[PDB]
Design a protein. Structure first.
Ligand SMILES: Nc1ccc(N2C(=O)C=CC2=O)cc1
Ligand SMILES: [Cl-]
Ligand SMILES: [Cl-]
Ligand SMILES: [Cl-]
Ligand SMILES: [Cl-]
Ligand SMILES: [Cl-]
Ligand SMILES: [Cl-]
Ligand SMILES: [Cl-]
Ligand SMILES: [Mg+2]
Length: 346
């Protein structure tokens, strides 16, 4: 049952993998990644070797979280797991974890910065993002890091969501950085407990950028970005203010002069009126009032692609491990069980 493994050193790293994976080629270094040819399936794949997966309790739990999430995702518009393996023959010698996915080429950044996008292209790209998000949200998963570099696109304009947020550093979110430009204001500023509605804010920012060719909220820091956001959508009323938990944050918001919501038709000049309407329903400051993924799929902007019989939901997903307090070797044994129980896709 166990395949034969072979060892090789590539760019100062030892790779020990099943014989089915051939012609390994480093492509980046979380972990290190190689492209390879999978002779069993005929696909070009990415093989990721995790770095120090069990070095702390925090790191061991994150390894388990990533493997559980990738094993669950089975949807045309979401990255899935082709294989997971370890050269260890027993739990006692278990130390390394390797993950195998389809090799991705272009991301949405390349399409946006380069090509000329018709409204038809925007419809199809945003439709596929929302189709994947309906699936993800139906399992009570929040992506939390949706942005153009985390969306893979091929020559036929087909799209996959990848790089789920496995929980970023403060330094990574500081300054003039794309890592913050797509984040909802309530999570950027820790206003309140957040939920899946943060992802719809991100879709609105991405859709705006496809329509204009320009970043919607390219702030030079957290406060500059908040000012750009409030100039477009308006300052909050008393209803949303009650929902912000920090007294200082509430005090700061009330220090700002009040501003009305702008006319989106005079911002997104020449856009399809149905695109403008959908943007007004995503980019809502109060997260309770944003449109959901399931509701957006039925919006008239997507009439040529919407098929309610081909927009599936996910199997239920048990996340109770997230509140569990375990030792390193307990998280490690749980991860080992999930490696050896993996069943490949058809
Ligand atoms: N700045 C800016 C650039 C482009 C746009 N635009 C749309 O939003 C849809 C067509 C179009 O040219 C709007 C503002
Ligand atoms: Cl093999
Ligand atoms: Cl996939
Ligand atoms: Cl090992
Ligand atoms: Cl990006
Ligand atoms: Cl005022
Ligand atoms: Cl489950
Ligand atoms: Cl421990
Ligand atoms: Mg990424």
């Amino acid at each position: 049952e166990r395949p034969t493994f072979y060892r090789q050193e590539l760019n100062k790293t030892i790779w020990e993998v099943p014989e089915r994976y051939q012609n390994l080629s480093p492509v980046g270094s979380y972990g290190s990644v190689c492209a390879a040819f999978d002779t069993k399936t005929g696909h070009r794949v990415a093989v990721k070797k995790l770095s120090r997966p069990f070095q702390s309790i925090i790191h061991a739990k994150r390894t388990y979280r990533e493997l559980r999430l990738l094993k669950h995702m089975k949807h045309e518009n979401v990255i899935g797991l082709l294989d997971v393996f370890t050269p260890a023959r027993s739990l006692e010698e278990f130390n390394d974890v390797y993950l195998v996915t389809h090799l991705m080429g272009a991301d949405l950044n390349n399409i946006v910065k380069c090509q000329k996008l018709t409204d038809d292209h925007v419809q199809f790209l945003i439709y596929q993002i929302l189709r994947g998000l309906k699936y993800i949200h139906s399992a009570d998963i929040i992506h939390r890091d949706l942005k153009p570099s985390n969306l893979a696109v091929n020559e036929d304009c087909e799209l996959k969501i990848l790089d789920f947020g496995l929980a970023h550093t403060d330094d990574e979110m500081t300054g003039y950085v794309a890592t913050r430009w797509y984040r909802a204001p309530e999570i950027m500023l820790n206003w309140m407990h957040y939920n899946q509605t943060v992802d719809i804010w991100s879709v609105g920012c991405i859709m705006a950028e496809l329509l204009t060719g320009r970043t919607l909220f390219p702030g030079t820091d957290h406060i500059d970005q908040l000012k750009l956001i409030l100039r477009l959508v308006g300052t909050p009323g008393a209803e949303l203010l009650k929902k912000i938990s920090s007294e200082s944050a509430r005090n700061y918001i009330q220090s700002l002069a009040q501003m009305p919501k702008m006319n989106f038709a005079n911002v997104f000049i020449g856009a399809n009126p149905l695109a403008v309407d959908l943007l007004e329903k995503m980019l809502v400051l109060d997260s309770d009032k944003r449109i959901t993924a399931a509701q957006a799929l039925a919006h008239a902007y997507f009439a040529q692609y919407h098929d309610p019989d081909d927009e599936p939901v996910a199997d239920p997903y048990d996340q109770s491990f997230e509140s569990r307090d375990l030792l390193i070797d307990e998280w490690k044994s749980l991860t080992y069980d999930e490696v050896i129980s993996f069943v490949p896709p058809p």
